[PDB]
Amino acid sequence: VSMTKTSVDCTMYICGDSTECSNLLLQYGSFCTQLNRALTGIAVEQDK
Amino acid sequence: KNKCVNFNFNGLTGTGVLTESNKKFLPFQQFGRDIADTTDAVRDPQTL
């Protein structure tokens, strides 16, 4: 019926406790925005 | 102990909580890594 609800973040996993790592991550654009938005809808999909 | 601190053991930076576990530390092991490619436990060189 359902699966395991796990939302993998692209901020802590890519940049683990770093300040200068987040400056190069935002230069790619909304790649971390569209992945966190897509994985949020999976948690609504497993509950629906 | 038991607080979200900024630990620094042997040049390894990161944000975590320094807790006490039940793992018997061997006298030659300096740091042990977990399955998530991160150091799970360290050893204080001043006092074992």
UniProtKB/Swiss-Prot annotation, chain A:
Disulfide bonds listed in the record: C10-C32, C15-C21
Domain of life: Viruses
Described function: Precursor of the fusion protein processed in the biosynthesis of the S protein and the formation of virus particle. Mediates fusion of the virion and cellular membranes by functioning as a class I viral fusion protein. Contains two viral fusion peptides that are unmasked after cleavage. The S2/S2' cleavage occurs during virus entry at the cell membrane by host TMPRSS2 or during endocytosis by host CSTL.
Protein name: Spike protein S2
Species this chain originates from: Severe acute respiratory syndrome coronavirus 2
Gene: S
Residues of the full protein shown: 729 to 776 of 1273
